[PDB]
Amino acid sequence: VSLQEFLKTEPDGTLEVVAEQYNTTLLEVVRNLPSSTVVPGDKFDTVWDTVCEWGNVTTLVHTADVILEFSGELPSGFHRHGYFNLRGKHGMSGHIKAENCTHIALIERKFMGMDTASILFFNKEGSAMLKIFLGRDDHRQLLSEQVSAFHTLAASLKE
Amino acid sequence: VSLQEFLKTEPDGTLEVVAEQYNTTLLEVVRNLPSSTVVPGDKFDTVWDTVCEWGNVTTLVHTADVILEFSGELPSGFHRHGYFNLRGKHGMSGHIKAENCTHIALIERKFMGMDTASILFFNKEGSAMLKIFLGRDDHRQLLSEQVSAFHTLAASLKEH
Known part of the structure; x- marks a missing residue:
């Protein structure tokens, strides 16, 4: 069976x-999902600033040996010298090389029977x-x- | 000329x-610092459970494109099926492949003139x-x- x-x-x-x-890449899989919206990374500010208004969300980073997840309001940030620098909001801060974000996807799917809705930020390797x-x-x-x-954000971006 | x-x-x-x-590796650099204590990764529980009592600390993870840092109390955790699973209370949770932690270092140094004190968890690549x-x-x-x-923890890690 082909991927799609x-x-x-x-x-x-x-x-x-x-x-x-x-x-293939995670991005290529996401593109072929039944319910996904994929936009270029120049929508970073629009996506980030929108999620900052949504209340408590979970932000997740995945490395080979660690998953850290932060539940709470998404901190606002500012761009300086290539970094997107987060402002300290009740716990989580840091920086993102946002110009290395080349694609963003909004995804809805079932994960082990659980409805999920996520935003994925992609690097140039997909x-x-x-x-x-x-x-x-x-x-x-x-x-x-x-x-x-x-759903309102997905419609505004694309769909 | 040499590293040390x-x-x-x-x-x-x-x-x-x-x-x-x-x-070279970050671990080899840390070993050659003037003020560092390096122990094996089997001290993970001792180190983790001790820091959980210290109040607000900053936990940092560093990838190629993101640094996220969490300021607050370190969550306790439990081991299950090779993961150390955090009981995230005030925001930060997640999981650590703690058996992939082969070394832990306590470091004191100046960073751009700022006194700093840190705990580094190392993987097998150093x-x-x-x-x-x-x-x-x-x-x-x-x-x-x-x-x-x-300082109390560093002294206790130097018992064994």
Whole structure:
């Protein structure tokens, strides 16, 4: 089966190993998803500044040996000398080489039966440099008000 | 000219640049610092559980394109199926492949004239998988109560 008709079931797990199995990038897998919106990285400020208004979200960084995730409001930031510098908001700060972000995707899919809505920031190799996931309530369901705002952003970008 | 001689006089920037400039690993640079304590990765639980008592610290992860840092209390965690899983309370959670941590270092040095005190967790290639830095006050000075606790941990790591 080719990649696009394969991603039309719903993979039993993460999108990263689908990319392996087809000798391709995470970005190429995301493009072939049933429900994804992919835009160039010059939409970074529009996407970032929009999510900053959504309330508590989860920001995630993945390395070979660590996953750190931060639940809370997305900090605002400013550009200086190639860096996007986060302003310290109740805990999380740091910097992003935002000009190395060449693509951004908004994704909706099931992950092990769980509705998910995420924003993926891609580097020039087609791999993820950062992920943001929508927040959840006490019964582990998405916050519908955030889902609505996410849908508004996807429509404004593309769809 | 040699690495240890070069480090006896405080480099003007980060320690990775020194390893870059010397074509070696960050761990080898850290070993040759004037003020460092290096222990094996089996001290992970002792180090982690100790820092969890220190108050607000800064935990940092560094990738090619992102640095994220979290200021606050270090979350406790539990081991399961090879992961150390954080019980994220006030924001930061996640998981660490702690059995891939082969060395831990406690470091004190000046960074651009600033006293700093850090804990570096190393992978088997001798590079950093995670960093924890001591907290600061509004004048950007270290919290001396944390520095004292850091010194207590370094002394205890030198028992074995």
